[PDB]
Amino acid sequence: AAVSDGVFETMDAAVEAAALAQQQYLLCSMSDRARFVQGIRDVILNQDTLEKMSRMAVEETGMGNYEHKLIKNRLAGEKTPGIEDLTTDAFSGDNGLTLVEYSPFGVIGAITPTTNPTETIVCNSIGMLAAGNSVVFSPHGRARQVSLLLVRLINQKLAALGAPENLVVTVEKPSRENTLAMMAHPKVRMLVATGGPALVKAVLSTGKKAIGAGAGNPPVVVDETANIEKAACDIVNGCSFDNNITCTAEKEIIAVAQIADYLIFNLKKNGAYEIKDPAVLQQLQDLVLTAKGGPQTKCVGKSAVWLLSQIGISVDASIKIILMEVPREHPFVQEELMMPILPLVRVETVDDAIDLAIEVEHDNRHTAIMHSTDVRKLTKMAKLIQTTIFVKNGPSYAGHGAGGEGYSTFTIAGPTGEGLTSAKSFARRRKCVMVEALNIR
Amino acid sequence: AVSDGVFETMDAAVEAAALAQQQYLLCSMSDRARFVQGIRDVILNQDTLEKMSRMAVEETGMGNYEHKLIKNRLAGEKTPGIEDLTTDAFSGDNGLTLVEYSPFGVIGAITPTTNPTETIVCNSIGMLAAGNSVVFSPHGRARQVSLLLVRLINQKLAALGAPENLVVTVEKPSRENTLAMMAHPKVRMLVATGGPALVKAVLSTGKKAIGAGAGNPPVVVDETANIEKAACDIVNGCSFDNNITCTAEKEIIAVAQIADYLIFNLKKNGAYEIKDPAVLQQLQDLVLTAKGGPQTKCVGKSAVWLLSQIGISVDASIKIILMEVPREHPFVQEELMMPILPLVRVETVDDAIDLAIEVEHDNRHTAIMHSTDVRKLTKMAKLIQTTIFVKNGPSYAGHGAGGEGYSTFTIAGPTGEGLTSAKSFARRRKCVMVEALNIR
Amino acid sequence: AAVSDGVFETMDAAVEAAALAQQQYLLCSMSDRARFVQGIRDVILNQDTLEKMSRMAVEETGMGNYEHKLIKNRLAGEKTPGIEDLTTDAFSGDNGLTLVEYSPFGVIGAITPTTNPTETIVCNSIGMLAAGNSVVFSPHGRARQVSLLLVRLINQKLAALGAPENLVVTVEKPSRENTLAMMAHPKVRMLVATGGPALVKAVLSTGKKAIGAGAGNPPVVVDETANIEKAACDIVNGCSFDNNITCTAEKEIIAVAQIADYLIFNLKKNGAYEIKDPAVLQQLQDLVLTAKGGPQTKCVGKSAVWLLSQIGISVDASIKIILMEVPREHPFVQEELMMPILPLVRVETVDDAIDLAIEVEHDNRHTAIMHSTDVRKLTKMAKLIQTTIFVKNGPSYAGHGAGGEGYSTFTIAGPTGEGLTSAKSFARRRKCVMVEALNIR
Amino acid sequence: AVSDGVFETMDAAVEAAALAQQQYLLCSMSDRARFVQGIRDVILNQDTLEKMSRMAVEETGMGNYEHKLIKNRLAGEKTPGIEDLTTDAFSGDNGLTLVEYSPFGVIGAITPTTNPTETIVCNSIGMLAAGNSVVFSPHGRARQVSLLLVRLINQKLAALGAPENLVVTVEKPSRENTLAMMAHPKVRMLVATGGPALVKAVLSTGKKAIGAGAGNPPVVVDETANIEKAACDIVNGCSFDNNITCTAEKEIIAVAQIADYLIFNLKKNGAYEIKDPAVLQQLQDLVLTAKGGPQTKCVGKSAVWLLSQIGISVDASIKIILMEVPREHPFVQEELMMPILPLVRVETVDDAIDLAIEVEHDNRHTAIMHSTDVRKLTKMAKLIQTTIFVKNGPSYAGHGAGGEGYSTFTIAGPTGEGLTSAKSFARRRKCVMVEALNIR
Ligand SMILES: NC(=O)c1ccc[n+]([C@@H]2O[C@H](COP(=O)([O-])OP(=O)(O)OC[C@H]3O[C@@H](n4cnc5c(N)ncnc54)[C@H](OP(=O)(O)O)[C@@H]3O)[C@@H](O)[C@H]2O)c1
Ligand SMILES: NC(=O)c1ccc[n+]([C@@H]2O[C@H](COP(=O)([O-])OP(=O)(O)OC[C@H]3O[C@@H](n4cnc5c(N)ncnc54)[C@H](OP(=O)(O)O)[C@@H]3O)[C@@H](O)[C@H]2O)c1
Ligand SMILES: NC(=O)c1ccc[n+]([C@@H]2O[C@H](COP(=O)([O-])OP(=O)(O)OC[C@H]3O[C@@H](n4cnc5c(N)ncnc54)[C@H](OP(=O)(O)O)[C@@H]3O)[C@@H](O)[C@H]2O)c1
Ligand SMILES: [K+]
Ligand SMILES: [K+]
Ligand SMILES: [K+]
Ligand SMILES: [K+]
């Protein structure tokens, strides 16, 4: 009588275990699904586990900050849709009744990132189990200890609820070699990749159904009609949240010249440290960029204080982002730093900002933000930029369900088109036609 | 001048469609509506309808003229338009949120020789309705009819002021062209309607892909069924377009107590029963290959024609060839796509369901059941987990011809989209207006 | 001085107090509504108050039993829809964006039944407050003490939650004369009536928007294809639930002759006491009927043990209903007894049973039940009888959400056509048209 | 032989509709679709369309022919058919639950002289779509045009194989006949499109009744609005059908900074501004009664007509009569239903919203606002709480002409149905299949 904890020595064993679990899960009720989904929430939302997970992940990856991981972890456990997300469509007429249902895929193989290692395990497992699947996690090696502990905790709770063993599994030695082994396993029916563009292309080359949640470079546009004070507060909060490691965070400002100066003034009131010295700006570049001009790993997810500390500047906790006005070609603008480093580009009109916001978004079709009260301008940018998420007059994280209407998720699929994934995304659509019967209108 | 939609190289076609898509983004929803209506008019024009139905059967040698008239009309009438692109909305204290269906870009579509014109009509309507351009990569066996339809569509759209090259294809449809479309960097989405090899290929391209694979639809008949009604439905669904629809019945699983009565009524409604094993081996030698798969020359041929090729002369009233064989028999396991319908006898309805899942080969495509017991209909529908499940009717009722719902000719099982429509070819986007527009 | 407890001396004072409160309620947020809705749930689902309410109702009215009010009150508190029932429809296109919302009516005047006194208040208040209304409750004289107590407990919880005073109010001495005043008070902008056919025609004659939950006479049809063992168990549970005082409970069996005997056999196994002596059946009629021929108020809602004991028959607690086979003309068939007395009419064919079920239903179009595994026959009866609720192969209370899919209500509108009332039913449909803006598809 | 739908007595019509509705229950949804379409063909037929529009203004003396063509066409094109009767479904461990829209029975509709043909066409399509029969009780003034429409409908329905008397009316429409219909026990639901007195009476008949009340729609223009676009939209919406449509603009509330520039642009789009109070006092004496309410002889007359009745000659370019009066002015406070548009100047947008609510008289019918500030647009929509709210467009954009959504000519403020359609004329029914058909 040895109950599994869900962590296996090899990827092949994890997949076979999750496959057998999926067959048994098919014999369960929707009520059973709901109890297991509620068990996952209970795990992450238990105040102790919540605090450990949040602190443990920041320590192991060095990315993010504790207080905001508490919020994001809670957001995942509280506002990830459950079985209620699996609605039913019905059409009744002379030819009978037709029902359309969301049924399970089978064994799903999920690949999680280093920025949100626990939040993405919580969100994926809740939605995938709600849809009747089993999930194999290939986590980032840099998030091994915390990712594996969370899996063990989930299995523990699920075992106490009488669930079939191994609904959620991972490997004891997370590595890229194991990810590839999962991507190649015949019994994996669907891949869900949350990471960079290189990962998204890989899973879309396996011969399997695959949801790809790629990267972005979210611009935020502030036009002359905007509540500048509010925009400044929303932009600093949105940019500095979790030290800018959320895929939706603001990562460049495109301000209309008429209001640019007053914006910068209010930015500095809300904790923005403006770098005006072109020599100090070069020190920051040397610190955060690599030879290839890309973000330096050791700096990703560090506070603005820490980053300024590294170049000999000492500031207090009130400073949340580092701010600089630079040309549109600057690397900080072009690159996805994932740091509380926020460039600002000055443009003449609101239409110029929209054009440059589309250009600098690099056609990721991911996220973009705009501050403005003119319904016409809000409509124009939203229509043109064609991003999976578009926030107006609020912090970027309002698109995640924290501050805006809608549920929350941590797998945002721009490329593959599924949008803000939920249990619906991890389900096959089925049609059931009862001919000339059950039409009782 | 103005493009007829056909190009010499695949790279030329994709580039043309890519620019048309950019131009298409400037058009209104009203423009999409007219262009969609234009495609309906092209195929619902009685003369073009008859020409396309006849020309398709002649070129591919598969199907029959009268039933192509029905399928082509279904694709043009019941394929959803821009009304399929609905808007979700949530409003509360944090303002308003909208969820919309937006364009994917340039879509490359591979279409089947069995339903060459129906798929082009169904695909393009939904794809252009979602704001996309489409590059079609037909198969060689249907080259002429597919190119004629593309040109006709480009004509009608040009008369409606549409950006040129919304629907394009190459002059020499070939396998190497398909592989080029699959690799071109401007193709944002692939849509494959065909066999398992095509669906796996398309899913190995590093692109978003919809895979509408093959099936082996079993029809289960239990002891609670209306036997003579089930006999008529089975024969109609099986022989429709000579069985080349991916959803048509292709093997019967009958409970033993009613099997003799089912066979009886099947013969009363156009089934030629084969009881002599000598003739059964003849039919196998004709329609099977050395490896054991369906013979391409026999696919899509009527029951009369097939029987003629083994010296049996019957009248037009015969629509299917029926035989009672074991479950391991080739006709059961293989997707013949012919009006040849093997029957397998089992003891109980539970054994029928178990065998129905096995014989479906995890294609998870289509299954049929005849039964009046609501508990048994529910059991089989839940367990077989196919994309379409039809109860107490012909298989084509799940296509929207005799059943509720819209119609499609690309049914995605592996990739899970179900019955593809305009929504299938769109990305979901979310628009959050923070703390405004909540007017409740 | 102190906050109102919700009870007022005159009806005018309560309508005025609710009119002011509803205006203050417009200044509240959807998040506030949710807390107020959750407050009502917390009140009735508080284990002590739950038992207290279930006990008081049965004692003060003499109808129902304690164990089953525990369930009905819990159902009303757990499965009544909240604010989430107020969806939003959107339409985007060339002409812009159209929203359709559910908005408040204002002050709602609600008349509750003596049979379901606490359950209707919980259900009505939740739905009406979720929609942004204030409710004036006009309970019947019998349920005075329990009604005022629930109203006082609601006002108490809402006050702690910071709500405006007097969102839920009633009068100190409920009476027919107070109900009439409420029905004619100008500031009352909607009437929701849960009761008999007289009350429904009254509110529909006041010159106000009125919802009318009428009476019924639910027949249960059993044909030859039905699982008879389960049918008997379900019919007994559904008929005896709360001693038959729920408006949806089975109140006459229409059995196909071929299975009528085996049905009666299993009914007896499941707690049915059959009366075969016509002299004994006569004693029951003299007890439960009036001179006019209607149900005796004294006997409404009493258990089967009680009713038998009052004609000199003692039985143990395993008896739940009194069964007798009678002609269709019998008064137990024609009358809505609201007692655990269940007649059985034998017919030849299932088409005969369907024809008779329609007749006996008396065009109430309220509730009906059928037991059958034939999909053709289930459809036939459902289409033809055209009732607001139709239940198949289960106890009648599955239409209430207790054993069936959907939410729960205790105000089922047949005449006015709103169906299973919820928050939507107490809200006005509004259209907002943004011309040529916010069409960001 | 076949009835034409017109009956001498009310009891005969209601009895005929009752019998018709019984026979209607046996018809398929396909039949309803056909009957619904048949009504669309009746009014969209160009000859009838022009006949009805012309015959209506001539008989009633209200509105004008050009705009009745648009409204009648709107009623026939954009009134939802049977597709409005959607089905909700919930499936789980406890089985399947369907929610359907079923018929009420016999509906008694009361149509206004303002929109006599439009209301009949809209109500009949929706009521027949839901599966009901309708007994129309027109007003005396529109008798001839109403009865001609009913007769054309019964003719076309009779050709389509419909049960006789799905749509009926009486030969001599009167108030006694309206009261008879209200009391008849076989009338299951009453639908009232008219003034407040009608709504109260119909809600006192002991029946289910939808009441479409009156409105006094204000239009708020604030300093963030496109003044040129606003001036053009206001004149067009106010003058449309000479202001008889219940949703049309009937008073302007303008913020002070833009009031003069708004008046300036209103005149450039067809507004004759009155500044001589002596002339205003003439208009008051013409278009009002001794009591102070609208004069029935002036309702629905063009601005050119109303101006000539006080010795002022203008050409067909003048569409409305403009004047800036204080809040208490009769024009402002009364639902004139004439192209007479008063303006009230206010200091801030907040003052305008407060006055807009005040002047709307709690009818909660219609309100319009011109602004680009998403925050201020939201504030007025949230607070005024009207059934229809239009932002940055002419009022009639709420009827579906110029805005998103379907069209209706019965707008229920008091009873809360909103923009009525086939759904509004149906009962909600729940069907519960316990522990079966849960096939997910
Ligand atoms: N749209 C969203 O929902 C979302 C959410 C969060 C983050 N992101 C984005 O993802 C990135 C987050 O950081 P990250 O470093 O953890 O992402 P990552 O660099 O792509 O790595 C994630 C996983 O992908 C593996 N991987 C990468 N390329 C692979 C390939 N060709 N073949 C097989 N496996 C491959 C990685 O192995 P290795 O360990 O060797 O790299 C790792 O296991 C950011 O770009 C962020 O914008 C997106
Ligand atoms: N799920 C759906 O929605 C759906 C719909 C329709 C069909 N299907 C499935 O599509 C499949 C239809 O098969 P399909 O053949 O039309 O498309 P396909 O199987 O995917 O591809 C067949 C093509 O390969 C070549 N080919 C096949 N056999 C050949 C042979 N003996 N010799 C030379 N070339 C050969 C031909 O191309 P060349 O022109 O180059 O010779 C032929 O057109 C069925 O399995 C059907 O069930 C699915
Ligand atoms: N569709 C639904 O949702 C629904 C729900 C529940 C009930 N119903 C139907 O409502 C009816 C039950 O309603 P109800 O019982 O609460 O009220 P009721 O039966 O309509 O009448 C009882 C109330 O009215 C007075 N009354 C009438 N007859 C009386 C009598 N013989 N003796 C003393 N008082 C009498 C009493 O008022 P005083 O207290 O002032 O004496 C009593 O409280 C049933 O017909 C039921 O089918 C429908
Ligand atoms: K950047
Ligand atoms: K086969
Ligand atoms: K009864
Ligand atoms: K006015």
Author numbering:
A (entry chain A), C (entry chain C): 82 to 522
B (entry chain B), D (entry chain D): 83 to 522
Reported in the publication:
Rhodopseudomonas palustris propanediol utilization protein (RpPduP) reduces propionyl-CoA to propionaldehyde and shows promiscuous activity with acetyl-CoA and other CoA-ester substrates. Nevertheless, the observed promiscuous activity suggested that RpPduP could be engineered into an NADPH-dependent glycolyl-CoA reductase (GCR). Thus, to realize a carbon-neutral photorespiration bypass, the reductase should be engineered to preferentially use NADPH over NADH so that reduction is favored over oxidation.
The variant with the highest specificity toward NADPH had four mutations: P222G, I257R, N261L, and I280L. We then carried out a second round of saturation mutagenesis at second-shell sites (T196, N197, A296, L481) and identified a variant with four mutations in the acyl binding pocket (L326I, P327T, V329T, and L481H) in addition to the four mutations in the NADPH site. This variant, named GCR exhibited NADPH preference as well as ∼12-fold improved selectivity for glycolyl-CoA over acetyl-CoA compared with wild-type RpPduP (in terms of kcat/KM ratios with NADPH). The X-ray crystal structure of GCR shows that binding to NADPH is facilitated by interaction of R257 with the 2′-phosphate of NADPH and that binding to glycolyl-CoA is mediated by three mutations to polar amino acids (T327, T329, and H481), which may form two new hydrogen bonds with the hydroxyl group of the glycolyl moiety. In GCR, R257 (Ile in wild-type RpPduP) facilitates NADP(H) binding by a π-stacking interaction with the adenine ring and also, a charge–charge interaction with the 2′-phosphate group. However, the GCR crystal structure also revealed alternative binding modes where the adenosine-2′-phosphate moiety assumes different positions. Nevertheless, in these cases, the nicotinamide moiety is still correctly positioned to catalyze the reduction reaction, and this structural heterogeneity may contribute to GCR’s cofactor promiscuity. Our final engineered variant, GCR, exhibited a 1.1-fold preference for NADPH over NADH. Although the evolved enzyme accepts both NADH and NADPH, the obtained shift in specificity was sufficient to prevent the reversal of the reaction even in the presence of equimolar NAD+. The kcat of GCR with glycolyl-CoA and NADPH is similar to that of Rubisco (∼3 s−1), and its affinity toward these substrates is not limiting (KM < 0.5 mM).
